[model samples]
Target chain A: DCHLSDMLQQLHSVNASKPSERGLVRQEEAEDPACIPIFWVSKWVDYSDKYGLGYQLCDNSVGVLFNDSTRLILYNDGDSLQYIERDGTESYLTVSSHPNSLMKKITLLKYFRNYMSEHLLKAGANITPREGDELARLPYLRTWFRTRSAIILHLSNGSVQINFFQDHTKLILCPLMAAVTYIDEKRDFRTYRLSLLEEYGCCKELASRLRYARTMVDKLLSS
Target chain B: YETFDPPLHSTAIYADEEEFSKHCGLSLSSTPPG
Candidate 1:
């Protein structure tokens, strides 16, 4: 019925396994400073080093990864609070217990980036979208077909750059590729999170800001 | 009808008790905000 609804179905189709066990791994929440725990992340050294002395660690079954600046929550499951803040001007956060699922999302975005690059080249458009952080520099067109929030078209640098995760076969960068998905997981389906780092503005600003958050998350994943 | 504690500077906070004693005079009335 709605693009957001359609997107959840599409994502569910792609994700056929338990969110806690695959993709990005999230461990138990941290209980106290005496025992800081990694959520889906295996190592928290990056946050420790990158953020240095200006970070607080908390655990409530909900694992929160954040860059402080905005008050947003994206709910993937239930019963937990996450706090993320630091530095200035901008902030980012990721508060989901099933981080393994988020990895798949990042993978989807990477594939989307790859899909967009090749797709645009075929259409005679002149733009280049890199596989990683460089994606922010390229231009992407965002449109809100019939939703409250605008979804950026990865088809264009701004288009094909978006690309999509198609069914087991072919891929294309059309007017509609990936929509901002609101998935409902069976295992943990009560807590909702609105990640500040992944929020869209003027439209695709959230997608643009997410480059860093995903970059950090994947980096944490790889290491 | 309660008296709030005064803020302290110059002294840093620590989790390790020894470190806490060195920097915070072993007196931490409050934990930093979560």
Candidate 2:
């Protein structure tokens, strides 16, 4: 949907912080840590377990139009996005997550990993290779470990739930899982297709085609 | 750090034209009130 796309763009722009406006402070400086500035985009997916056909998508967009130069952190919770900034000296937390418990946690970890990896790559930050003895005492890698834990936990829980449900109902959960599996397999196949397209420098064209297809599907569904 | 009724403003000062204009300029009217 245009709304979802717009929200995503707004969030992307906010997180990218403009260069010119990073030096302003205001009245509540003493009471709050400078707010981390962020723009956020969010999408919600609701799926029905019974009929397996009812799904609703909600797109929420936010942008940081103006800021007084605050440091902020963005957290992703599947369906909801949160922007946290400093309130005076103390850090303030804001959360946005999808309403669905399973999807929300999964999306949160996805964004978290992406954020950290992006930051590390952009900064050219390096970590020391750990030797056996030093590996036991590594502190620099704690963040990586913690993030990996979150990823593992969410994925494992999702898998366990899917399996449990499928085991109980051969007709319902089995079909649902099969459908999701097909979609997942298709996603992987498309990734491979894109790789071949990139070899010919047709990635952009392929992406455009995909976008068009997505738009058409959305229109059809909405109608 | 432990002061309770330490200091309170006894009176309020009225803003002059220049100050009022500056205040008006600083006010972000374009932002939604919410």
Candidate 3:
């Protein structure tokens, strides 16, 4: 069972923007929100005795987040609690621990900027100081640094819910092409692509965003 | 004439620490090279 509303509420609270108590100004309202929230689907369906978990692109505009108690098939979502099996086979992994810093805002922005710059270079586009400066000054981007909170991921049957403050720096800096490239390179896309496709079934919709981003970068490079 | 023989020494499958770490979400410092 997916707790869609709860997740949205949590996101809304964390995504509060200045001059608006509603939190998370819609793209239509902000024009350029620093971080864009994309929902990738994690599906769990009852087919046999055991539940199966698979990734899909979320078709819905809004995503869901679940509380921990919810049970879901955990064949391969990346989490520690789900790794343990009844047989006592322990699976261990080494991950880059979230850096312990009071400046999480700065860290997140840096990740967004670095992710964007790296992708732009990869796409044969040049990074312009003017564009970079303009992007940095965006209200949504500015607000991201000022607001910080803990991110929690709840995994349940047929759903993976994430609770976090929206920071559009990643979206602004990486653009769609770079964002997808980053996700693919990092293997994060596999987890959520299916849901995205379902929500926005037309590949053109996703591809168009990337192509447009590429063109923008190209123009920026030339200028 | 032809002969077939098994190797005296066998090689072990190496465990990829980085890949394992990514999957498990554990810290690298705790993982040992396989």
Candidate 4:
């Protein structure tokens, strides 16, 4: 979504431009926007409905979905906060900020959202989950991810699905979201956990503990 | 000869993610040639 995120901030530069002077700003400083971590912060219950209300969290910036909708919009500079008409928060967050605004935007959840969103778009379906997938969107299960040429997730049934950015994976996960995200499980186990926190909730001690369990499985190989 | 029913794999590109991912993955520039 860098195209979306990038263009959002670009619009301001053109509008705020004073004849451009052919490349540099004249009257005002450049839009110098920071694509800071943005979130569609909200309680889990709101997602329960596939069609509700949606709006711009900020003008000429990001598209906000307090209810339901989708758009690829202009990216803006400067860290702006768009909330549900009350908080005026600097960044978006969830119910208690368990995973917090920062965690949601920067971690696994960001990728998870990307994973689901991409899958939907490919299906000729919009961003909202199809009636069947709505259940999959609930914040109920612990999601795992792996990657390949693209992102992947596992199905409990053992047949691998290409990407889940969710419950599981069959191959390596590709980073297909806006460029600001980095998937470093080695250092940010907290991030890995927070990425799926809505479904997995306050991952607590288990989150940290699972980090050490990556013992390589030795087996007879015949590749 | 008249064209008949298309094979299941003919419209595979728009099938599903697994269907599309494998199709989409191979389409990437980095994939090795057959």
DockQ of each two-chain model: 0.02, 0.01, 0.04, 0.01
What TM-score fits each model? 0.18, 0.16, 0.19, 0.18
Q: TM-score of the candidate numbered 1?
A: 0.18
lDDT of 1 by residue, A1-223 (tens): 2433433333333222322333333222211122111111100111211211111111111122222221122222332222323331222335334444243332222222232222221211111211334223212111111112211222112121121122111111211343222111111101111221112111132223223223322322243
lDDT of 4 by residue, A66-106 (tens): 32222112123323232333222233433333345433322
Q: What tier of docking accuracy does candidate 2 attain? A: incorrect
The regions of model 1 sitting more than 4 angstroms off are A1-4, A12-176, A179-223, B12-34
**lDDT of every model, 2 decimals:** 0.23, 0.21, 0.23, 0.23
Model 3 stretches with alpha carbons more than 4 Å out? A1-27, A31-33, A37-39, A42-45, A56-82, A86-90, A93-153, A156-223, B1-34
Per-candidate total of colliding backbone pairs: 29, 15, 25, 29
List the per-model TM-score of the A chain.
Answer: 0.17, 0.16, 0.20, 0.18
- Give the docking tier of candidate 1: incorrect
lDDT tens digits, residue span A1-223, model 2: 3433432333233223321233442212211111110110111111112111111111112211113222222322233333323342323233433334233323333433332232211110111111323222101000100111111001101110010111111000011111111012111211112122222222232333333323322332353
Model 3, C-alpha of A184: deviation from truth (Å) = 23
What are the runs in model 2 whose C-alpha is more than 4 Å off?
A: A1-190, A193-195, A198-214, A217-223, B1-34
Q: Report the candidate with higher TM-score, 1 versus 3.
A: 3
